[PDB]
Amino acid sequence: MKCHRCGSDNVRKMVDSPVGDAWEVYVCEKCCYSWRSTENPVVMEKFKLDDNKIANMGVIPPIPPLK
Amino acid sequence: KVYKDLREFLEVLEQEGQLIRVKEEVNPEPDIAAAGRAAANLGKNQPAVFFEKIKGYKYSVVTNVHGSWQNHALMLGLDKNTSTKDQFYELNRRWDKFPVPPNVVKREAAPCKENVIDKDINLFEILPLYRINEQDGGFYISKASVVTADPEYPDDFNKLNVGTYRIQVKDRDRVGIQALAMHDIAVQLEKAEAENKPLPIAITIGNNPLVTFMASTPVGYNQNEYEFVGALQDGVPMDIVKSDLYDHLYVPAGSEVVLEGHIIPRVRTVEGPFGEFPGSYSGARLQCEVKIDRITHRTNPIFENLYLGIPWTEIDYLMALNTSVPLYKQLKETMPEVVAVNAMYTHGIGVIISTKVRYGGYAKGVAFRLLSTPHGMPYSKIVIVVDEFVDPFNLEQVMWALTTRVHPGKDVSIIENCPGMPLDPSTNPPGMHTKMIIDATTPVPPEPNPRETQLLDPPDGTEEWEEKLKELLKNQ
Amino acid sequence: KVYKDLREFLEVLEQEGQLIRVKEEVNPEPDIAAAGRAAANLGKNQPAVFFEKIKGYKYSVVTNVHGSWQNHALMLGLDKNTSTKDQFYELNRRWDKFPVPPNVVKREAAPCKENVIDKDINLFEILPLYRINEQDGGFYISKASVVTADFNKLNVGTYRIQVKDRDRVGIQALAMHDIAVQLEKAEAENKPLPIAITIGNNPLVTFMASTPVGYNQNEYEFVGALQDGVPMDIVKSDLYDHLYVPAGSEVVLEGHIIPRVRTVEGPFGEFPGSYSGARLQCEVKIDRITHRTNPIFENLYLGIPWTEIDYLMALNTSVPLYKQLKETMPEVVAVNAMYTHGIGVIISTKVRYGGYAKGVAFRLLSTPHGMPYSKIVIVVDEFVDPFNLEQVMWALTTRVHPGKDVSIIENCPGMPLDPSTNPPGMHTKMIIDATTPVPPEPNPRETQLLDPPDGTEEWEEKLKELLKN
Amino acid sequence: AKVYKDLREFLEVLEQEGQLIRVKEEVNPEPDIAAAGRAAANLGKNQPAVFFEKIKGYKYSVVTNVHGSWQNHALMLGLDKNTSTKDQFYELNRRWDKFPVPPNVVKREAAPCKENVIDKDINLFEILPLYRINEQDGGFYISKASVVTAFNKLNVGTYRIQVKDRDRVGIQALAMHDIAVQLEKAEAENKPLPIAITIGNNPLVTFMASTPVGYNQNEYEFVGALQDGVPMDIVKSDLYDHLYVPAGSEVVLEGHIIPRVRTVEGPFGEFPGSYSGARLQCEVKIDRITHRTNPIFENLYLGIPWTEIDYLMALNTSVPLYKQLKETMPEVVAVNAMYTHGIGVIISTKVRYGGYAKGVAFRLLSTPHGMPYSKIVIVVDEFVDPFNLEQVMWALTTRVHPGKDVSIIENCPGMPLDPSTNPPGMHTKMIIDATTPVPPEPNPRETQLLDPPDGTEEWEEKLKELLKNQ
Ligand SMILES: [Rb+]
Ligand SMILES: [Rb+]
Ligand SMILES: [Rb+]
Ligand SMILES: [Rb+]
Ligand SMILES: [Rb+]
Ligand SMILES: [Rb+]
Ligand SMILES: [Zn+2]
């Protein structure tokens, strides 16, 4: 069950439905995309990510050096 | 009247006919967001929408709380049909009231301290979380009031700050946040992440509508955050209570949910995309995450969340008059002829100023002043100036003034290479503006008038007949 | 839902809370005009105001009958909270319906023929006349449907009617166009010119009388088109066999233009919001009054816009412009030409190719009405409701690069009623392209708009039904 | 009113009216035939057709510049050769909507184009004296053919044809918008798409093929309308029952677009005056050639305007624009949209009220063609002949105050074939109001024009008759 945004298999279940067995929420460990088992999300090509886009993503704000 | 929390405001809304109860159970997506969009689409008298049952969840959701001028009027304790101009004058009258220091309340007497979660923190067992827009990166908390301060100096709330920032749920006990968008936390965060220390914040959900109002206000007021809320309550202090884990952080006593946590140092993860007030999606960026160390909430809390999309939605009402009142005060300091400023359109990119024209051409001078204020300089792209008797919030009145007092050959000025804002997607070059000034005012000497007309001044007794017809209208 | 007369519309207005009854005796001035202005100043959901008692008068007055989008919606038989855009689509849908010939009813079947005043004619014993604006030259009948005329030559328009005497009124004869040749011949031969002045009407009759151009049907046939195929009842005038009036009009004034008489008429307010001048205008003698029992003087207040008169000129200006543009540009979605008889126009359209938004504006600026009238033309995208000015202002602030999206064209046709024109009667047009660029126009930064969530349309109906209960 | 049944009857009239030159001595294919076409166009006025009796290494003859003057254009319409361009415009507008004039289908035996048939060893060079039109052309080109493709859905247009083999040619498939629907299905099924390429035609046939929009009739009916009610003769093609060709065509090449075949075609000149780019385009296999005895290759030179191609696009672009303007604007007198497929337009109109001329230009700039094509729009008064560029210059120099009569509107639709567009494909429109002010526009100094002396029209007729008798 791949992540709809970046296509990674590195997906884990975030939570179960607090009431009943209605749904679950999954989350991608690579790009942090999350979705419920209810919805069938189609991610627009403009909003899809690959390792290239993630590695070249803008880091806001820059992490200062230690010490 | 004054509201101690959101529930008091919600019942006032329902009593005035500004709240709908969706009795049946709904799905998280796309029901709640589509209802928020639907309520926004009603145009006028748009109510808040209250969901009692959401599938898989145990608690409630309310949306479009601020999403109409009726709800906005009731927020300030006014009659719900109060015109936007009159709401603007009431906000301007209350803006500078001081002092009204907040009332600090014992921990037990604070309703936000009723239930405590300190282990196995799961936001989903508290908040019915859902996807606001189709292409959002995750489920978002979109109407939180986020509290920061300085640890060493409590500053007696001189350094404590409250603003609204979008909160992306990353896990059961983790959320994303836009750290650079949190001014007053920049150097506090650089120091924290340089020596690898957490930075504590408090995230309050479900508040007194004036608290969300001040939180949606970033500049323009000189009082302390909670003191400004008191100033907007016509001089009635609000109740605050110390956070459980952090001494320097104070939350409102009546919040439905309080999320106490800290920014995790040296951590950047993909946040977004999410909607922004220009009606489009932000980009996905590597932003900061917050660990949630404790949750304190009222019994059966209500997830007060906001839908935003193509304007107008609720977000526009959170930025309408709190943008316009500061600009009006800056213009008025040097131009007492200014009657009102309507800067409600895309965070003041569109501005309509009503003014008395001192002498010929004075209306463009008023625009020059706006285009030289801290906010109007880079933001304000389209500036319309109308006469003193024209309500600049009545766009039908502004249209009339445009069609009868604007000679586009001379009343319209196009000025290139001025400061701009990148969030205006039509800027070319990006971040630069070509300004447009429109002088929809009647010529006064020494400007020649091509055809002087006598306007149809309202008949005597008009104001009294307004109050008369109004009292007859509520008695139907 | 259709209405036989004004009374059927008024009772529907009261059912929807869109009518206020003033049960107490008021003074003719300034009370009635101030209530018309106050009703307009309520901004939204503005009601009609009905005065049961006016000092010195026998009968009643109603004002602001058309003075809100709620009232406009009920006039079309729609739910009162129907948006303006949907009212525009409803009007456009009915506009061309043909044939709906009117029903000529016998005289004793027409309620307007209930009472007859053939001698000692006194307008004041029928209409509670008053001064509308303080600088008016006299008391005015401001919402009358005036009939002139075979049936193809019959015309109905609304014209201001200044009361000059108990049986004499002023009229702007040149403002009536189908009478110019007939009037020159009548005054050259020193003959009267018969006209019929109707007061208190089916709201769609007044709407058609407020429409001077844009329809191909006959006057009363067009009313049948506005009623979604329901014919309206008409009846022959008492004195003039070629003049037909609505059967259920509250008051019918049968008279004639007095030949070769010019007297001081005005001043009086006009829709741009200012006083017109006093001119030597034609007078009309009233030869017969024909009225229902307990007649209702339906009159209009006008002043600084918006007032009721803006509603009588809003969508009936916009629909013909939309049809003219739609014939060659099917991408056009809606035309909002409601501002000062269409001097300000907002067009929503799909953009076929780069720059197409200005081509749409060029089309409007070359229509018979848009060419001299339309000075400010804003073009917005297909998803923007051009009747929602908040949405239009959003489009302005995010889709207008004033360095290229704003075009200023000098020495174009204008209208003298625009007081800012210099030279008078000439326009400098302003086109504003508040649309999103499409190829091959380069985009400085293309964004993805927050498309509304699935199920939004169904949730609008559900929320409305929930507010009903 | 002369109606022509083929190219020969028209070439005869041209020669009789002094509008055709015979080159009796042998010429080289290049650069003689092209240079002669360019030289004929360069003559400026009364430019004639040029007929080459002998070309080196070829058996048959070539004619060029057939449509290349207003005299030749007038004789095409059956009018006296010195009929003014304005009057030729008014005649086309009169005949444009004539309906119905259904074509007359003749039997194969009676169609001169069926005189000789070649089905095996097809060699285009044994029929057409093929030559290079311009120095950088990709090869030798058929530049004036009428291509028939398919009765209401039969279409005739002109498309450039690059000769690739003795029996193979290249064609601009996407330029034939009407074949795309069947073309995609054909290529996906590997199916030939039959076409017919006719060369050397009655001049009104080529005019209709050079007209891609603006008439409601079907192709051959429209020719009949342009012939004032005389039907034109057509004949069924030899191999394809649904394709009909003119009965009098000099040569008919029946064949098919080859599916799934894309080869480099071009460069070739285009009417803006420059070479096109060399693209991979569709190829056509010629399956049968039917031609008259002693066929005459009617080809066309194109270069820096004006050349013959400008006359094939001049008045058939103007007439539809005139009709669209006239519907709502009866004051419009004539539309001259002859310059670079209507990128430059001159309109003469009566000015109904102050500023009306700019409204007329707005209407043109919102027509389906004028909106993306027309960049420079000049409006003149009703008494100014918009086709007489001297009179237009007079209106410009005496009625244009550039501070107010000249409007420049950015970010409007444009066409990429205008190379000066920046951004490419977008236009900055220019409206020039060369009309006299009428109220309520103020006139800085009103003048009394020198209206023509009474009898001028009668004296025009008298002087022309007097000249002929000399
Ligand atoms: Rb704040
Ligand atoms: Rb002005
Ligand atoms: Rb009418
Ligand atoms: Rb634009
Ligand atoms: Rb054609
Ligand atoms: Rb001019
Ligand atoms: Zn992912």
Curated annotation (Swiss-Prot), chain A:
It comes from the Bacteria. Involved in the non-oxidative decarboxylation and detoxification of phenolic derivatives under anaerobic conditions, however the precise biochemical function of ShdD in metabolism of phenolic acid is unknown. It comes from Sedimentibacter hydroxybenzoicus (Clostridium hydroxybenzoicum). The keyword Hydrolase does not apply. This is Protein ShdD. NCBIfam families: VdcD (NF041205). It is not known, if phenolic acid decarboxylase forms a complex composed of ShdB, ShdC and ShdD. The term subunit is often used in reference to the operon, however there is no experimental evidence to prove the existence of the complex. One of its GO terms (biological process) is response to toxic substance. Keywords: Aromatic hydrocarbons catabolism, Detoxification. InterPro entries: VdcD-like.
Swiss-Prot record, chain B:
Prenylated FMN binds at N161, V162, G163, T164, Y165, R166, M182, H183. Binds 1 prenylated FMN per subunit. The active site is at E276 (proton donor). It catalyses: 4-hydroxybenzoate + H(+) = phenol + CO2; 3,4-dihydroxybenzoate + H(+) = catechol + CO2. Pfam families: UbiD (PF01977), UbiD_C (PF20696), UbiD_N (PF20695). Its cofactor is prenylated FMN; Mn(2+). Inhibited by Zn(2+), (2,3,4)-trihydroxybenzoate and (3,4,5)-trihydroxybenzoate. Ammonium and rubidium ions decrease the activity of the carboxylation of 3,4-dihydroxybenzoate by about 20%. One of its GO terms (cellular component) is cytosol. Keywords: Aromatic hydrocarbons catabolism, Decarboxylase, Detoxification, Flavoprotein, FMN, Lyase, Manganese, Metal-binding. Optimum pH is between 5.6-6.2. Optimum temperature is 50 degrees Celsius. Its EC number is 4.1.1.63, 4.1.1.61. One of its GO terms (biological process) is catabolic process. Residues 441-464 are annotated as: Disordered. It comes from the Bacteria. Induction: By 4-hydroxybenzoate and 3,4-dihydroxybenzoate. One of its GO terms (molecular function) is metal ion binding. Involved in the non-oxidative decarboxylation and detoxification of phenolic derivatives under anaerobic conditions. Oxygen-sensitive phenolic acid decarboxylase that catalyzes the reversible decarboxylation of 4-hydroxybenzoate and 3,4-dihydroxybenzoate. PANTHER family: 3-OCTAPRENYL-4-HYDROXYBENZOATE CARBOXY-LYASE-RELATED, FERULIC ACID DECARBOXYLASE 1. Homohexamer. This is Phenolic acid decarboxylase. It comes from Sedimentibacter hydroxybenzoicus (Clostridium hydroxybenzoicum).
Swiss-Prot record, chain C:
Induction: By 4-hydroxybenzoate and 3,4-dihydroxybenzoate. Optimum pH is between 5.6-6.2. It comes from Sedimentibacter hydroxybenzoicus. One of its GO terms (biological process) is response to toxic substance. InterPro entries: BsdC, PAD_UbiD-like, UbiD, UbiD-like_C, UbiD-like_N, UbiD_Rift_dom. Prenylated FMN binds at N155, V156, G157, T158, Y159, R160, M176, H177. Pfam families: UbiD, UbiD_C, UbiD_N. Mn(2+) binds at N155, H177, E219. The gene is shdC. Binds 1 prenylated FMN per subunit. This is Phenolic acid decarboxylase. Involved in the non-oxidative decarboxylation and detoxification of phenolic derivatives under anaerobic conditions. Oxygen-sensitive phenolic acid decarboxylase that catalyzes the reversible decarboxylation of 4-hydroxybenzoate and 3,4-dihydroxybenzoate.
